[PDB]
Amino acid sequence: IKNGNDRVAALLVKEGATLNIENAGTFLCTVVAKGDSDFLKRLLSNGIDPNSKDYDHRTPLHVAASEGFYVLAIQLVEASANVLAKDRWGNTPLDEALGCGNKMLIKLLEDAKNSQISS
Amino acid sequence: IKNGNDRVAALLVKEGATLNIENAGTFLCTVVAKGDSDFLKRLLSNGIDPNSKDYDHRTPLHVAASEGFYVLAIQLVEASANVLAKDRWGNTPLDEALGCGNKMLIKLLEDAKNSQISS
Amino acid sequence: IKNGNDRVAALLVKEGATLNIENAGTFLCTVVAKGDSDFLKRLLSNGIDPNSKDYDHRTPLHVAASEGFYVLAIQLVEASANVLAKDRWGNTPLDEALGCGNKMLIKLLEDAKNSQISS
C-alpha cells in the first residue's frame, strides 16, 4: 500500500489478507493530519475500521473536522463512519466541525447527521 | 505520472523531460474537480505552470476556492501561484473564496494576499 | 532502549548521540496508555524533551492526568515540562486532573503545578 503497489495489493486481498496495525486509532488520525488522500483511500478499501478510537477516544472524523479538510472527509462519510460519536470530554464530530466554522462542511455534516438519523 | 511510477518519472526529468499537453489550463482544473491530491502533487513536481488559464480565463485557483478544497489550496500556492488574478467577468481568487464562505480558507487567502502584496 | 539494554545506550550517548524521532509528541503520549513505566523511565535518561505534543496539541501530562496515574505522573512531573498548557480543546492539564478525581494524586499534581508555576 505505501510503496504505490496497488496492483499487487489486489492479489493479496483476493487470496485473503488483512493488515494488522497497532495504535490503529491514532495511526489513521496521523495520516489525516498529514493531508494525503490517495494513501488514505487505498487503505480504506482494505477493510480498516473508520471508527477506530485513539488513546484519547478520538475518531478520525474529529481530525478532519478540526482541520477543516473537506475532501478527506468525503471518503470517511462514504465508509458508513459514525457521526454521532463523542470526544474524551464530549463533543460530536458535527458539533466540532460547526464549532470551528465551515459553511460548506456544515451542509455535509448536516447530511451525514440526517443519514445517521434516518439510519 | 498517471500510473504513479514516480521512480521512473524522476529518472526522465534528470535525463531531460517535460509535460507537452494541449489545453494545460483546462486539464489542470478538471483534475482539481476530481479531488485527487497525489496525482495533482506529482504534476507540479515536473514544473507545470499552476497559473495556466482555461478557455474561459480560469486559473486552477478559482476551481479549488469555489469548491472548497483546503488541502489542494496549500499545494497550489506552494508553487508561487498568482493570487491576484481575475475571472472572465472579473473576480479575484480570494474574493471568490470569500464569496463562497470559509473562515479557514479566508485566513489562508489573506496570507496569500499578504504574500502577493509583499512580493 | 526497546531491548532493555542501557549499556549500549550509555556508550552511544557518550559519543554524541541524539534521540530524534518523527512525531515525537504522538509517541510520547501513547506509551503511557500501555503503562510501560520501565520503558518510560529509561526514556528520560537520554535527554529527550518531554514537552512535545501530538496533533491535538496534547502533552503527555494531559493524557496522564486523564488516565489517572500516580507513579507515572510523578516521573513526568519531575521532568519539569510546563505546568498548564492550553490544548486544542482549550482545557488546561491542571483542570483535567481535577476533573478526573484522584484526590490522593490531585493534591500532588496541584503541588507540582504550583511549584512549576512558582519557578
List chain A residues with CB under 8 Å of B69.
70-71
The residue behind cell 486481498 is: A13
Packing angle, helices A71-78 and A60-67, rounded to 10: 150
Eight-state DSSP code of residue B116: H
C-alpha B24/C-alpha A98 separation (Å) is 37
Q: Which three cell numbers stand for residue A55?
A: 488513546
Q: How many CA atoms lie within 13 A of B54 on its CB side?
A: 17
Asked whether the CA dihedral C59, C61, C66, C69 is positive or negative, the reply is: positive
Nearest to C55 among A23, A29, A87 (CB): A29
Experimental method used, please? cryo-EM
Please say whether the beta carbons of B94 and B83 come within 8 A. yes
Distances in whole angstroms, Cα of residue B103 to Cα of each of A91, B107, C52: 21, 7, 28
List chain A residues with CB under 8 Å of C26.
26, 30
Q: Where are the alpha helices (DSSP H) in A16-102?
A: 24-34, 38-44, 60-67, 71-78, 93-100
Contact A103 B104 (CB under 8 A): no
Distances in whole angstroms, Cα of residue A80 to Cα of each of A28, A49, A75, B18, C67: 16, 10, 9, 42, 30
Contact B69 A72 (CB under 8 A): no
Residue B47, amino acid: G
| Nearest of B87, B35, B25 to residue B62 by alpha carbon | B87
Top residue of A56, A66, A86, A96 to mutate, by most chain C CBs within 10 Å, is A56
| Nearest of C61, C26, C89 to residue A29 by alpha carbon | C26
List chain A residues with CB under 8 Å of B38.
36-39
